[PDB]
């Protein structure tokens, strides 16, 4: 579905930004995925908004050659007119190891179909 699809793209998107293989202007069509009110807690419990979000993928761009990201485990928690609120586990691994994480993500949807992040909570495994 959409959603789903959007889940896997954003983190493609995320993954070769991170690696070092992202196209031009990459940075800045990735966070346009995002809404202006967008926060997220990480899985060190800390909270980040847009801006902050964006200012650490500028400082961590092509910091992690080789990186591969899994994302399954989605479901649909809660879906209407204005979005949905999913769950899903998201794998990470590259030379300095591999990390494992569940997440919840609510995405607010227009009426032309286009998803926005709005909220994003991770907390970290094993």
Known sequence: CAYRREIHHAHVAIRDWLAGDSRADALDALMARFAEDFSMVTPHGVVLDKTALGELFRSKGGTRPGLRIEIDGESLLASGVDGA?????????????????????????????????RHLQETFCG
Do not use: N
């Open 85 to 117: 609120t999913l769950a899903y586990r998201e794998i990470q691994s590259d030379a300095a190891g591999r990390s494992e994480r569940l997440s919840t993500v609510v995405l607010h949807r227009d009426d032309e179909g286009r998803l926005y992040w």
